[PDB]
Amino acid sequence: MKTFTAKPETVKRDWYVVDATGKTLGRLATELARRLRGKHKAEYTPHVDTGDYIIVLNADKVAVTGNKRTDKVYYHHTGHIGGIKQATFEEMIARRPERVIEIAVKGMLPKGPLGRAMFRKLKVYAGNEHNHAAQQPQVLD
Amino acid sequence: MKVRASVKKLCRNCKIVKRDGVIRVICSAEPKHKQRQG
Amino acid sequence: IGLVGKKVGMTRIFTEDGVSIPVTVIEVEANRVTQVKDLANDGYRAIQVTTGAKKANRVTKPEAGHFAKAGVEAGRGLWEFRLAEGEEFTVGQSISVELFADVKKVDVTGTSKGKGFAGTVKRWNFRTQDATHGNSLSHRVPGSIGQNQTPGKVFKGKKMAGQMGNERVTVQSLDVVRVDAERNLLLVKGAVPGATGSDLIVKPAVKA
Amino acid sequence: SRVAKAPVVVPAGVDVKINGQVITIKGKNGELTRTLNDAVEVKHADNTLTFGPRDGYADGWAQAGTARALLNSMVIGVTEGFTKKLQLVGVGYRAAVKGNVINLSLGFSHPVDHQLPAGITAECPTQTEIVLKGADKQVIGQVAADLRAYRRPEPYKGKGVRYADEVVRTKEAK
RNA sequence: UGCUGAAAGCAUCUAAGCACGAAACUUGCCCCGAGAUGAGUUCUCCCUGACUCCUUGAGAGUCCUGAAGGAACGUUGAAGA
RNA sequence: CGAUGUCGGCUCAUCACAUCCUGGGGCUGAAGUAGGUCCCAAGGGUAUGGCUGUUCGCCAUUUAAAGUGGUACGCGAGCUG
RNA sequence: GUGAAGAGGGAAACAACCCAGACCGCCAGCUAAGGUCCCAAAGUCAUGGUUAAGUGGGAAACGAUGUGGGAAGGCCCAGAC
Ligand SMILES: [Mg+2]
Ligand SMILES: [Mg+2]
Ligand SMILES: [Mg+2]
Ligand SMILES: [Mg+2]
Ligand SMILES: [Mg+2]
Ligand SMILES: [Mg+2]
Ligand SMILES: [Mg+2]
Ligand SMILES: [Mg+2]
Ligand SMILES: [Mg+2]
Ligand SMILES: [Mg+2]
Ligand SMILES: [Mg+2]
Ligand SMILES: [Mg+2]
Ligand SMILES: [Mg+2]
Ligand SMILES: [Mg+2]
Ligand SMILES: [Mg+2]
Ligand SMILES: [Mg+2]
Ligand SMILES: [Mg+2]
Ligand SMILES: [Mg+2]
Ligand SMILES: [Mg+2]
Ligand SMILES: [Mg+2]
Ligand SMILES: [Mg+2]
Ligand SMILES: [Mg+2]
Ligand SMILES: [Mg+2]
Ligand SMILES: [Mg+2]
Ligand SMILES: [Mg+2]
Ligand SMILES: [Mg+2]
Ligand SMILES: [Mg+2]
Ligand SMILES: [Mg+2]
Ligand SMILES: [Mg+2]
Ligand SMILES: [Mg+2]
Ligand SMILES: [Mg+2]
Ligand SMILES: [Mg+2]
Ligand SMILES: [Mg+2]
Ligand SMILES: [Mg+2]
Ligand SMILES: [Mg+2]
Ligand SMILES: [Mg+2]
Ligand SMILES: [Mg+2]
Ligand SMILES: [Mg+2]
Ligand SMILES: [Mg+2]
Ligand SMILES: [Mg+2]
Ligand SMILES: [Mg+2]
Ligand SMILES: [Mg+2]
Ligand SMILES: [Mg+2]
Ligand SMILES: [Mg+2]
Ligand SMILES: [Mg+2]
Ligand SMILES: [Mg+2]
Ligand SMILES: [Mg+2]
Ligand SMILES: [Mg+2]
Ligand SMILES: [Mg+2]
Ligand SMILES: [Mg+2]
Ligand SMILES: [Mg+2]
Ligand SMILES: [Mg+2]
Ligand SMILES: [Mg+2]
Ligand SMILES: [Mg+2]
Ligand SMILES: [Mg+2]
Ligand SMILES: [Mg+2]
Ligand SMILES: [Mg+2]
Ligand SMILES: [Mg+2]
Ligand SMILES: [Mg+2]
Ligand SMILES: [Mg+2]
Ligand SMILES: [Mg+2]
Ligand SMILES: [Mg+2]
Ligand SMILES: [Mg+2]
Ligand SMILES: [Mg+2]
Ligand SMILES: [Mg+2]
Ligand SMILES: [Mg+2]
Ligand SMILES: [Mg+2]
Ligand SMILES: [Mg+2]
Ligand SMILES: [Mg+2]
Ligand SMILES: [Mg+2]
Ligand SMILES: [Mg+2]
Ligand SMILES: [Mg+2]
Ligand SMILES: [Mg+2]
Ligand SMILES: [Mg+2]
Ligand SMILES: [Mg+2]
Ligand SMILES: [Mg+2]
Ligand SMILES: [Mg+2]
Ligand SMILES: [Mg+2]
Ligand SMILES: [Mg+2]
Ligand SMILES: [Mg+2]
Ligand SMILES: [Mg+2]
Ligand SMILES: [Mg+2]
Ligand SMILES: [Mg+2]
Ligand SMILES: [Mg+2]
Ligand SMILES: [Mg+2]
Ligand SMILES: [Mg+2]
Ligand SMILES: [Mg+2]
Ligand SMILES: [Mg+2]
Ligand SMILES: [Mg+2]
Ligand SMILES: [Mg+2]
Ligand SMILES: [Mg+2]
Ligand SMILES: [Mg+2]
Ligand SMILES: [Mg+2]
Ligand SMILES: [Mg+2]
Ligand SMILES: [Mg+2]
Ligand SMILES: [Mg+2]
Ligand SMILES: [Mg+2]
C-alpha cells in the first residue's frame, strides 16, 4: 500500500490576512513560512506546494526587540568589484518596508524551485489597504 | 583625552561615568585627566 | 521644463569688447504638446511633446492616432519632460524658444557621436606600452586584466575594449548667448553632443 | 527613590491634567505638556503631587525621581519662568535683538542670526549682554548652549560668550 | 560637544527624553535599467467569418479571410566587425 | 618533481586601514602662525628625474600629499629579459 | 582508541573527534550520540533563576558605583553620609 501524495491539481488553496502591527519579526515570519510551506495541513507533501496564500498588511509597523531597530544590518553585494551595500533595520523600513518581511520569510523557506514557488504565495504590504478583496481572504492570528 | 585601556581616578575631582557603553573619567580641575575606554 | 532641438553646427559670436565666444547653434522648432500625464492616471506629472514634421505615409496608424487625439501635426519623434509643480501645460500647445529668454545656463543632452568599436587606448585612456625596446605584438594592448589565483577571475566593470559613443550624454550648465525667436534659434557657449543634424534635448540648468 | 519620596507642591492658578501618562500643566507664563514614561505612575493626593514606581518594571525608582524633578521644574517654570544671563567678553563682540531673532557680531565675516524656537523671550540690557527668559528649562538651556557654541570661552583672555555664573580657567603663554 | 535629568537630597551628556556633529553612510548630479519571471504603468492602433469532426478538449480540422504592423528587398547614413 | 615559469621593470589594477594629503575632533609643555600627540574617518587623491638589474636607498628639484600593507613578495597562455 | 582496512548517525561541510561496527529484504517499532521556532524529523514543553551585552555566537594582563546571590564588619534619632 503506497501512501498518499498531494496532487497539485487537487490541492485546495486558502487565502489569509495577517496584520503584523506590533508583532515580532521572526515569530511572525516563522508562522508565515509554516503556512506558506503547508506544514499545518494534514495532506503535507514535501515536493508539492500545499501551503496557503497569505497577505501580510502593515509590514512597516512590525516590531523588533532589544537594539535591533538600529543594530540589525542587512548586507548585500552588488556583484561588483568592491560593492558591498549594507542597511540597518531602520533604514530598511524607511526605504523598503516590504523587504523586511520578504527577507525574513525567504530565509526560512526552502531553497529551490518549490521554495521560490511558495514565496510567490506571500503578499506583503506597507499600508493597511490590500487589493485582494476578490478572494475573500479570511483573518489569521 | 587619553584612550588608554586602564582608565583610573588620577586626582580627587576625577569622576567615573559610563556613557553609551564606554567608561570615561571626566574631571573638573585638569582637563588632562579627561580619559576614555577600559 | 525643456525643449527638443536639432543641432546645426557651430559658429562664434564676436562681442565688441574683444572676445569671440564659440557657440553651438541649436534650431528649436515649435515644440507642440501631444499629451499631459498627471498623478491621477500615471502617478507622475509630466508632458509629452513633439517637433518638426513627418511624411503622411511614413507615420504609422498607432502614431497617427496618438497625434490625432491632440489635434497637432505629426512631429518627427516624441519626447517627455517632468513638470516642476507650479507650471502646468495644456494639450495642443506650441512651446516656443522664448522659454529660455529669461534663463542663463542650460544642460544640453544628446546622443554622442558613435566612435564604433574602440580600443582601451581610445576608450579608457590606457597608456600605450613601449613602441620598441623589445616589445612583441603588444603595443596598444590592455596588458594585465586581473591578479592571479586569489580572485581567479576578472572583476566586473573592468575597463576593456568595446563600443565607444552612440550613447546618451549630458553637458551641464552651458551659458546661453542669444535666443533668436524670428529664426527659432538658441545659441549656447561651447560644444554639445551628437553631430550636425542630431536631436538634442535642451533644458534649464539644475545646479543654479 | 528619595527625591521621588518628597511631594511636589502645586500653587493656585496652576491647572494640571493627567491624560493617562501624558501630563499637561497650564499656568500664567505658559502651557506645558509632558509625555511621561510608562514605568512611572503619577496621582493627585491632596494639594501636592505623588510620584511612585510601577510594580513589575525593573527600574522604578530611577524613573520615578525623574518625573518628580521634571515636574518640580515644570511647575516652577509656569509659575516663575526661568532666566539665563549670558555675557559677551572681548572687544568687537556684541549682541542685539530684533523680534525673535538674536543678531550677533562675534568677530566673524558674516552676521550670526540666531533663531529662537518656542516661547523664549530674549533681551539685551547692555550691548554686550544677553538675558533670555521662558517657561522650559530644556529650550532655554539648549538655546543658551547654542548661543555659547558660536564662540566658547578662549582659555587665555576669556573671550567669547559666557554664562554669568560660570567660572573660566585661564593659562599663561609658553 | 551639549541640554534637561533620576539611580546616588549633590554631582552626572543617559537610564526615560531633547539637540548639534565629517570628503565616510543614504540622497541630491550623471548613465543604464521591466528577463524587476514581482516580466510594471499609461497613450494609441487593428482584427466582430462560415462549417465539420471527436475522448463535451484551453481540442484535430475544412473552406474562407490576411488587419494593424513587421520582415524581406532596394537606395543608404556623422549608425556599424 | 608524468613541470605550480620564481628578482626588477612596463601595462593593467583591486582590496585592507595600522591615514601621507584632504575632512571632523580631544589634551597640550596650544597667544597667533606653525606644530606635538591621540580619537573618528578608506570618498577622492597620492611626483618627475640622477645613479644602480635593482626592490630599496642616497641625492636633485617639486608637491596639498609624494601613505603602509594584502592580492602566487597581484599581474610572462599580457609585454620586457 | 580510532583510521589505515569501517559504511551508518552527530560535530554546517570534516580519514584520524563523539555515537555505533553495514549477511540480504521490509512504506513496522525502541533507542544512542546529537537534538526538538522556520530551513529540517521532534517541546514556540513546565517550572524556578541569570544575562541587555546579539553576550550567547573568537582572545590576555589590567580597567570599571553594569548587574544578581550570600557572609561579616563599620557607626549613628544623643539623626551617621
Ligand atoms: Mg554619541
Ligand atoms: Mg485606466
Ligand atoms: Mg521620420
Ligand atoms: Mg559611426
Ligand atoms: Mg584605436
Ligand atoms: Mg590608464
Ligand atoms: Mg609609454
Ligand atoms: Mg626579443
Ligand atoms: Mg608573445
Ligand atoms: Mg618573438
Ligand atoms: Mg600596433
Ligand atoms: Mg571561486
Ligand atoms: Mg529581578
Ligand atoms: Mg542646569
Ligand atoms: Mg540634576
Ligand atoms: Mg553618594
Ligand atoms: Mg552609591
Ligand atoms: Mg549638572
Ligand atoms: Mg558637560
Ligand atoms: Mg572637495
Ligand atoms: Mg529606458
Ligand atoms: Mg512566474
Ligand atoms: Mg504591461
Ligand atoms: Mg492593467
Ligand atoms: Mg487600460
Ligand atoms: Mg484516445
Ligand atoms: Mg495580400
Ligand atoms: Mg495572400
Ligand atoms: Mg488593407
Ligand atoms: Mg550598412
Ligand atoms: Mg556601411
Ligand atoms: Mg606526477
Ligand atoms: Mg599534470
Ligand atoms: Mg604555467
Ligand atoms: Mg617579478
Ligand atoms: Mg622604468
Ligand atoms: Mg609600472
Ligand atoms: Mg577604483
Ligand atoms: Mg582601498
Ligand atoms: Mg599610532
Ligand atoms: Mg596623520
Ligand atoms: Mg598636514
Ligand atoms: Mg581644505
Ligand atoms: Mg581637518
Ligand atoms: Mg572646512
Ligand atoms: Mg585636524
Ligand atoms: Mg590651538
Ligand atoms: Mg577624543
Ligand atoms: Mg581608524
Ligand atoms: Mg574605495
Ligand atoms: Mg566604502
Ligand atoms: Mg558620498
Ligand atoms: Mg575610484
Ligand atoms: Mg603613494
Ligand atoms: Mg615615486
Ligand atoms: Mg633628498
Ligand atoms: Mg609598501
Ligand atoms: Mg609564485
Ligand atoms: Mg606575502
Ligand atoms: Mg610575483
Ligand atoms: Mg610588500
Ligand atoms: Mg610571451
Ligand atoms: Mg611575474
Ligand atoms: Mg598569467
Ligand atoms: Mg601573447
Ligand atoms: Mg635573452
Ligand atoms: Mg640580452
Ligand atoms: Mg570510526
Ligand atoms: Mg595503505
Ligand atoms: Mg565512520
Ligand atoms: Mg559520519
Ligand atoms: Mg565544525
Ligand atoms: Mg545541520
Ligand atoms: Mg553530514
Ligand atoms: Mg572514517
Ligand atoms: Mg564520550
Ligand atoms: Mg556485523
Ligand atoms: Mg549482523
Ligand atoms: Mg522514540
Ligand atoms: Mg528509553
Ligand atoms: Mg551526552
Ligand atoms: Mg538525550
Ligand atoms: Mg537541505
Ligand atoms: Mg519541524
Ligand atoms: Mg516540529
Ligand atoms: Mg505553537
Ligand atoms: Mg511561550
Ligand atoms: Mg516555554
Ligand atoms: Mg520558561
Ligand atoms: Mg531576573
Ligand atoms: Mg533582563
Ligand atoms: Mg560574538
Ligand atoms: Mg570576540
Ligand atoms: Mg575599582
Ligand atoms: Mg549602583
Ligand atoms: Mg539583569
Ligand atoms: Mg558565600
The verdict on A47 touching C (C-beta cutoff 8 Å) is: no
Closest of C36, C42, C40 to residue C95, by C-alpha: C36
Terminal Cα distance for chain B, rounded:
13
Chain C: list its partners (3+ Cβ pairs within 8 Å). Answer: A
DSSP string, B1-38: -B--SS----SSS-EEEEETTEEEEE-SS-GGG-EE--
In DSSP notation, D35-49 reads E--TTEEEEE-SSSE
Question: What method was applied to determine this entry?
Answer: cryo-EM
- Take residue C199 and report the three cell numbers written for it: 536631436
Residues of chain A with Cβ-Cβ distance to C159 below 8 Å are: none
Q: Which nucleotide is nearest to B30 (CA to C1')?
A: F27
Residues D36 and D20: their CA atoms lie apart, in Å, by 9
Q: What is the 3-state secondary structure (H, E, C) of D84-127?
A: EEEEEECCCCCEEEECCEEEECCCCCCCEEEECCCCEEEECCCC
Q: How many CB atoms lie within 10 A of CB C134?
A: 5
CB C203 within 8 A of CB C80: no
Find the ligand nearest to D154 CA: 47
Neighbours of chain D (3+ CB pairs under 8 A): none
Number of neighbouring beta carbons within 10 Å of residue D46: 8
d(CA D81, CA D62): 27
Q: Name the residue with cell 600605450.
A: C128
Contact indicator for D119, D134 with CB cutoff of 8 Å: yes
- 3-class SS of residue D14: coil
Distance CA D119, CA D99 (A): 12
Task: Tell me the nearest-neighbour CA distance from A123 into chain C, angstroms.
Answer: 22
Residues 82-141 in A having a C-beta less than 7 A from any atom of strand G are 107-111
Q: Is it the case that chain C and chain A have 3 or more CB pairs lying under 8 Å apart?
A: yes
* Ligand number, closest to the Cα atom of A115: 83
**Is the CB of residue C50 less than 8 Å from the CB of residue C67?**
yes
CB-CB neighbours of A127 under 10 Å: 10
CB pair distance less than 8 Å for A79 and C156: yes
List the helix and strand counts (H, then E) for chain D. Answer: 2, 12
Please give the residue of chain C at the shortest CA–CA distance from A78. C156
Residue D20 CA, distance from chain mean position:
25
